[PDB]
Design a protein around this nucleic acid. Structure first.
Lengths: 95, 60, 206, 149, 78, 125
RNA sequence: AGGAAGAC
RNA sequence: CAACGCGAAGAACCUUACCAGGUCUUGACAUCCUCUGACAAUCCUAGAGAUAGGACGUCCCCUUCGGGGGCAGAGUGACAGGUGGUGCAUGGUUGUCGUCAGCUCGUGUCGUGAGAUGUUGGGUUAAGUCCCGCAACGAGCGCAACCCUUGAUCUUAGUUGCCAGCAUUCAGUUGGGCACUCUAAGGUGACUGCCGGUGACAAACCGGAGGAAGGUGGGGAUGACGUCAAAUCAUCAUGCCCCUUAUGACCUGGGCUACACACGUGCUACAAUGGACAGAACAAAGGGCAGCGAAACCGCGAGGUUAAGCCAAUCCCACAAAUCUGUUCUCAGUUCGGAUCGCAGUCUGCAACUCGACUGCGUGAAGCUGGAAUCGCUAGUAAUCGCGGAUCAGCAUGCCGCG
């Protein structure tokens, strides 16, 4: 079973990565390291002024990034335990 | 007169091609972004306030 | 032709966001609805002088935390605000809400409260210069590392509109690890419309 | 301000023939190279057995006969916009010589590129040349107006 | 109207057909610049809105492929 | 089985040279209809001839990304890394001969209000 | 010690 | 200069404010008074708009039978609306000088005073950057650094990559494995760190060495006090003006795209450092579910058909051109150049005449590198060649980004 997670904040996604690795390792779930997936980018350009001065512009970056983990063995009781485990509100888990 | 055309914006139009996009947090057409429904002015003001958590200053 | 907004320049690199979630393919109507929460909270809690609100999504539950720096005239009997806010917010958004309050110790170093203080003396019609000196004295007697204050508009003179600045300490706007709290407030008087911009250098980040 | 130059080396220092190595692998770039250089090599061959001797020394005296020694600049003095001749640094000599070679070769106009390039190489080989005559125009202006120093 | 035929205002289409199948009558009042001239409309009189008035036009036999709109240009120059 | 890496102008290449009889090959297609633009020929013939290690090693080259001249520069850096890996006894001679620069000359970020990140559009009074 | 050059 | 591919990151009808036509008075937009307490949709007559009447055709929940939960409508006045004028009534934003290196204060000296000093002078720097004399000693905003990205490596992390080391097949897809590119966290790293010579030995400058780069490695973001009563009442807001049986409203059609002209910015060329045709190529960065749409078939073409895969390092856009080898044209208004024009179409959309894009034809125009003057450009920079993306049903030579 593969679990993805994609969000903006790579700090709290990193501590979420070792926290899920720690839970899966203490459950003994044939753990695999979290693979860094490439980010996705969207750069928007806004008129700096309100009414005039078209050469005055500003750029706003949006960057969001994803990581993947894999569990080889079934281990359904620990899988249901990590389903019922609570998650922070930024980790954005996808099954 | 702006909120007459705001009433056009929330009301469904006669034919479906007559429908157009307005950002509806602030009051204008003309450079609304589709995926936020905010135009440049109210977008950049509320982004400097700090909402839309994907957005920050851009440099590379 | 002015400085770029410092909180908007600091967010993402040093400043954490005030919203910590993701929405996919429904991002637009969550931004519309949670700005409806933020305007409603501002409109009904301007007396209680919230510094900032911050939200998160709990898989079709939303959590709100409100920073007000006083329980005194805010919480009432203790449950009055949470019932009158939670039922009303449920009625507005149609989703499960949860609300929590937080307080700011050493409460005169928060910029939004400082700009609201200046604005409140401007509808109190005490003189703007006295407002600047009293707020500078209040912020230094609370303790700080730098304050810059600006009030612009028609300051009592009808035929001219000019700004006034008052500062103390160091406020570098160009060092990134500086933690400026910035605030803009709007004051409506019989003379007209006045803009306040206060920005405070509280400390340092390593 | 101040001038500054850099260092860079394309060829090998030893066991490297300068003109042969230049001829095979150096300083003509950005496309239309292959067919042009093969037909240019056989243009070199047809002028090789068109002349009655080795062709490299007549190519090099063609480079001498296009290669300028002095030119004259314009300086603002008085109300006449007078001209001042000047002695020339060797890199500027090389840049001017190749620059007049290529632009008058592309500028006179002929059937096609290889025979026209050979046409002004042979036109520089003999003394009666067009851009050669321009080099002596630069001199006859220079030693017409070198009473200014 | 590129592959499947002329695209018109059917209400006054059936109105002018029920006119001409019975008799010949007065000018047809229309605000609509929309319509293509159908080939069975030969010999009628159409009052087209130019923006300020309803100009009268007779329909000749040569109304082969072009729509009704060119009968009333909307700009006056010299 | 000495293995080297090379990067130049948004392109990478990896080289593997083992003791052979002096064979040189990129992508298992040969010189004639695989290698145009004889700057590549002087690329593939310069360093083996300036060293005394020409007919001893055979090299397989794998290629990813980029254009022709930047690819040639990636070949330069790959074979320079391969030789400094294999025979470091004259690696210092290779150093002050040069060719180890790994130039940072990549495409410039286009600036807003400018055409090519140097060119302002046009000006008039 | 090395040009004549108006008005707002 | 700092207006003129500017607000507009997209006018067929709404956008749309402007014009004509026909229509409204508590109006769709916010709250009080009183009922019904659930409202509407389907087809006609006019219908284009309100309107007027018709076929089922004003249809929830708590309920001590009293009434409430604001959604829908109905009549009423307080009303609401103004993209209408005032940027010289204003806040809020922005350009400019200008990434120019400057702009000031505290305390104290000198001066009757305005003022001065610090902030001048010497040596270097890109810098008021550093240091030595000095009635100055300090401080603050600026400069530089910290931030992001591109530049090499160690550890960890190998799928939806890598096929090195192996066995296998035209699809090298697979059975197996992370060392490399690759994606990325912690870093390692370049900081005047050593030698010599100058510099009173200080700060600095020049030449040398492991190095990926030596003297802020390249770029971005960052724009001080102020000036131009610079620009915006087009997001919001006391100040007056008209209305509220109307500059405020509903819709249909038109206009914003007109045209004797002059200008700003760009595109395409005038060609054999090419055109046409044929073959081999090298593959950056983004977008995709009211979507991206592969294969195959049909079509002298844009396209159509049923449609596998993808909620994305797998599937699609994605078939990159300029590039490299062959034949032709042989210097011409030409096999250049492609604009106007007629015919016949494809797609989108209720609708392409006013006023969309694209294709197949035929027609082939001016133009043979452009006077006065004038513009941009210093370690992938100019120039060319393409490629994406944004507003959007559809419309690039505009703009942003990438190679």
């Amino acid at each position: 079973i593969r679990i993805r997670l994609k969000a903006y904040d790579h700090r709290i996604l990193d501590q979420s990565a070792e926290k899920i690795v720690e839970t899966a390792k203490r459950s003994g779930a044939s753990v695999s390291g979290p693979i860094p997936l490439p980010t996705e980018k969207s750069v928007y350009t806004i008129l700096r002024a309100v009414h005039k001065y078209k050469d005055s512009r500003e750029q706003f970056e949006m960057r969001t990034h994803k990581r993947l983990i894999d569990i080889v063995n079934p281990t359904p009781q620990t899988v249901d335990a990590l389903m019922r485990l609570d998650l922070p509100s930024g980790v954005d888990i996808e099954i | 007169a702006k909120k007459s055309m705001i009433a056009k914006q929330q009301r469904t139009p006669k034919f479906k091609v007559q429908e157009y996009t307005r950002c509806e947090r602030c009051g204008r057409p003309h450079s609304v972004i589709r995926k936020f429904k905010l135009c440049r002015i109210c977008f950049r003001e509320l982004a400097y306030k700090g909402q839309i958590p994907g957005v920050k200053k851009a440099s590379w | 032709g002015q400085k770029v907004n410092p909180v908007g320049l600091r967010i993402g690199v040093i400043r954490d966001w005030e919203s910590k979630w993701y929405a996919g393919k429904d991002y637009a109507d969550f931004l519309h609805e949670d700005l409806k929460i933020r305007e409603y909270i501002s409109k009904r809690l301007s007396d209680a002088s919230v510094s900032k609100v911050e939200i998160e999504r709990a898989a079709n539950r939303v959590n709100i935390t409100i920073h007000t720096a006083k329980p005194g005239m805010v919480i009432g009997k203790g449950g009055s605000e949470v019932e009158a806010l939670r039922k009303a917010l449920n009625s507005l958004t149609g989703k499960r809400v949860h609300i929590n309050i937080l307080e700011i110790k050493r409460a005169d170093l928060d910029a939004q409260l400082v700009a609201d203080n200046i604005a409140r003396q401007l509808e109190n019609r005490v003189s703007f210069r006295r407002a600047q000196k009293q707020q500078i004295q209040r912020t230094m007697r609370a303790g700080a590392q730098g304050v810059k204050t600006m009030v612009s508009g028609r300051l009592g003179g009808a035929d001219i509109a000019r700004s006034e600045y008052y500062s103390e300490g160091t406020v570098p706007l160009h060092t990134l690890r500086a933690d400026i709290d910035y605030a803009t407030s709007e004051a409506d008087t019989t003379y007209g419309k006045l803009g306040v911009k206060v920005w405070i250098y509280r400390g340092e980040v390593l | 301000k101040g001038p500054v130059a850099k260092r860079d080396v394309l060829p090998d220092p030893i066991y490297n023939s300068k003109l042969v190595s230049r001829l095979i692998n150096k300083m003509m770039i950005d496309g239309k190279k292959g067919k042009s250089q093969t037909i240019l090599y056989k243009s070199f061959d047809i002028i090789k057995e068109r002349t009655g001797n080795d062709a490299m020394e007549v190519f090099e005296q063609a480079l001498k006969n296009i290669m300028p020694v002095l030119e004259v600049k314009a300086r603002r003095v008085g109300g006449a916009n007078y001209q001042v001749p000047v002695e020339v640094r060797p890199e500027r000599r090389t840049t001017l010589g190749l620059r007049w070679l290529v632009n008058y070769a592309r500028l006179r106009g002929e059937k096609t590129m290889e025979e026209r390039l050979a046409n002004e190489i042979l036109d520089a080989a003999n003394n009666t040349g067009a851009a050669v005559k321009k080099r002596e125009d630069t001199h006859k202006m220079a030693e017409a107006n070198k009473a200014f120093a | 109207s590129l592959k499947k035929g002329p695209f018109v205002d059917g209400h006054l289409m059936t109105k002018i057909e029920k006119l001409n199948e019975t008799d010949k009558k007065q000018v047809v009042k229309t605000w609509s610049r929309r319509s293509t001239i159908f080939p069975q409309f030969i010999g009628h009189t159409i009052a087209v809105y130019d923006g300020r008035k309803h100009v009268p036009v007779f329909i000749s036999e040569d109304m082969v492929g072009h729509k009704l709109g060119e009968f009333a240009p909307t700009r006056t120059y010299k | 089985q000495y293995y080297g890496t090379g990067r130049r102008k948004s392109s990478v290449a990896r080289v593997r040279l083992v003791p052979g009889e002096g064979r040189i090959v990129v992508n298992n297609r040969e010189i004639s209809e695989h290698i145009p633009s004889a700057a590549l020929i002087e690329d593939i013939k310069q360093p083996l001839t300036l060293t005394e290690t020409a007919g001893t090693y055979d090299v397989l080259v794998n290629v990813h990304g980029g254009g022709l001249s930047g690819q040639a520069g990636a070949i330069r850096h790959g074979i320079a890394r391969a030789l400094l890996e294999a025979d470091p006894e004259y690696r210092t001679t290779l150093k002050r001969a040069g060719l180890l620069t790994r130039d940072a000359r990549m495409k410039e970020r286009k600036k807003y209000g400018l055409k090519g990140a140097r060119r302002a559009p046009q000006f008039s009074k």
